[model samples]
Target: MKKYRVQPDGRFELKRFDPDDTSAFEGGKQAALEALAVLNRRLEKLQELLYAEGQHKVLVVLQAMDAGGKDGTIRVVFDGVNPSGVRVASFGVPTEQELARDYLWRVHQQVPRKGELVIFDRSHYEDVLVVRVKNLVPQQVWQKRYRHIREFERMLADEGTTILKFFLHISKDEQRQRLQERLDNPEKRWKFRMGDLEDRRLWDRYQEAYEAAIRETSTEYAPWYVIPANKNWYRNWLVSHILVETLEGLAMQYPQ
Candidate 1:
């Protein structure tokens, strides 16, 4: 039985990602690598078909705590994917322009077009997670996003988009180690930020908010999966598998 299977909560959690035995991948890194290669090719193929056929769209949303491998995932997971056919949108703190509109307004522009796949590195959910945890926005306002997100995602689902969401689950200890490594190593220094330190101080609050956010937003159309992030390779592999599986289940194909 694969541990990474989504639980009743619709979230893939740490326990599943924590391999009782890494030998599964350790013994088969080559195979794992190959699997990812195949998925990338298929995603590329589908995107080409979509572009040519003008068919369905895709919206792949990735949300996680700091150091959750969002950027790194882009590098390894999509290295084999066709860059021209794919579009990636990375979300940060709302800029002056974005803040001027509704929260989803900024992200709305980045949804996948017909025959395209769009990946959100950090997403609208950040408003519910970090913003709520830090009290960056009013509680009533951010809390309502739980419902707003459902409606927003529902719109995508109805519009022929696969709204797959991933919540990369890493342990507190692992996050601490990764943060320290970023701070201590010169080559990794660029990755660290004083803001990350501030967030770490409220680690418990973040987790609580994240858990709530995932549980609230997960749905049949755009359910959340908690990917165990300790093993970047496994995390990469599991996510690739999930993406391929999601697209396949949609019966997506090349137009014609």
Candidate 2:
């Protein structure tokens, strides 16, 4: 997982990462799936202990290009976990009320509570990623957000939230195939949006924005792992492995 983590040394480059990478795990898909099942069970137990302890808070932030598999990652990696202890908050287009406040105002409300794990399907990074790439706001506005986000996450960490952010790294070819699959499969067609194509056209720009955001905001308190997401099995396995290992490191116990 360290190999995939974006170091906060101001030397990160998104191009250096291979989106199709799966070298972290050997023995191919079958072995990884079996390992993932074991991890799932471990994660379930960890979640129980985490909830019972009622002390630690865990926050998992996930970001990706369209069809980079954020939904699938949540579904597969978290399978069989106690839903009562785990919550998913998906950030889509902001509502009128959300727009009325500072960008972080809506996100600050979604931080994990004691003994809980909250997953952000898309997070406040959007202000820098999409907003910067699409010019939704002027450069001066989004530029300062990098500092604000770093300080915000630091505050969360200081308050006892264990933050783990993952960037689902998928290749352009993989995304094209995924979008095509959505169009070809009737059940998934509802997810297909013409605007997705428009976004696709700005792929390079989006990549640049993502690189900048990850580079600027990744800190000791909240590190970003650029998970190789071109291979679904590998992605699932790596994320689950990191998450399970992180929880286990907490040495949590059931409250007496």
Candidate 3:
């Protein structure tokens, strides 16, 4: 897991991480799944303790390309957790009201409260990644947001939030297969959007944008994990493992 963490040394390279790498765990898919089930049960108890203690906050930020498995990760990694203590905030296109305020306004409102674990499906990083690649804002504007985000996350950490950011790394070919699968299956067809192809065309630019953003924002308080996400089992296992370990490290206890 440490190998996947982007250190704050400003030397992070997205190309260096292999999306299919699963060497962190042996024993193949069945073993990983069994381990994940164990993790899932442990997570349930940890989350209950967290809520009962009500002294700590946890924020899990997830970012990825289209069909990179954000939803699936949330589904599997968080399976059987106490939903009352855990919540997921999915950010899509900004609405008119959201656009009226500064970029971080809406995001600020979504931060986890004490005794809560919040997951951001796509987060404020979009201000840097999508805005930069699509030219939605001038370079000067979006560039400064790296500082804004770093400071924002730092403030959250200082206020007792344990922030863990994960960038789900999937290859271009994997995204194509996922998109095609969505189209081919009647159950998943509703998720396929024509605009996905348009974004797929700008894949290289998005990669550059992601690399720059991850390099700039991976800090000590709020670190980024570039997760190998081509294999769903591996991705789910690794994420669950990291998250469970982090929560356990908090040493949370039930109220006396």
Model 3 lDDT per residue over 1-256, tens place: 7878889999999999999999899778999999999999999999999999999999999999999989999998888888899999988889999999999999999999999999999999999988888899999999899999999999999999999999999999999999999999999999887978989999999999999999999999999999999999999999998899999999989887
Estimate the Cα RMSD of every predicted model relative to the unseen true structure: 2.9, 0.7, 0.7
lDDT per residue (tens digit) for residues 85-174 in model 1: 678899988899998999899999899988787889999998888788878888888878988998999998898887878777787788
Q: How many residue pairs in model 2 have overlapping backbones?
A: 0
Which segments of candidate 1 are over 4 A away from where they belong? 1-31
Residue 15 of candidate 1: its Cα lDDT? Answer: 37
RMSD of 2: 0.7
Off by over 4 Å in 2: none
Task: Give residue 83's error in model 2 in angstroms.
Answer: 1.1
lDDT (0 to 1) per candidate: 0.76, 0.94, 0.94
RMSD of 3: 0.7
lDDT of 1 at 220: 77
Clash pairs, candidate 1, are: 12-226
TM-score of 1: 0.87
Q: Find the 10 residues in a row with the least total lDDT in model 2.
A: 1-10
lDDT of 2 by residue, 1-256 (tens): 6798788898999999899888899779999999999999999999999999999999999999999989999999988999899999999999999999999999999999999999999999998988988898899999999999999999999999999999999999999999999999999999987978989999999999999999999999999999999989999999999999999989998876
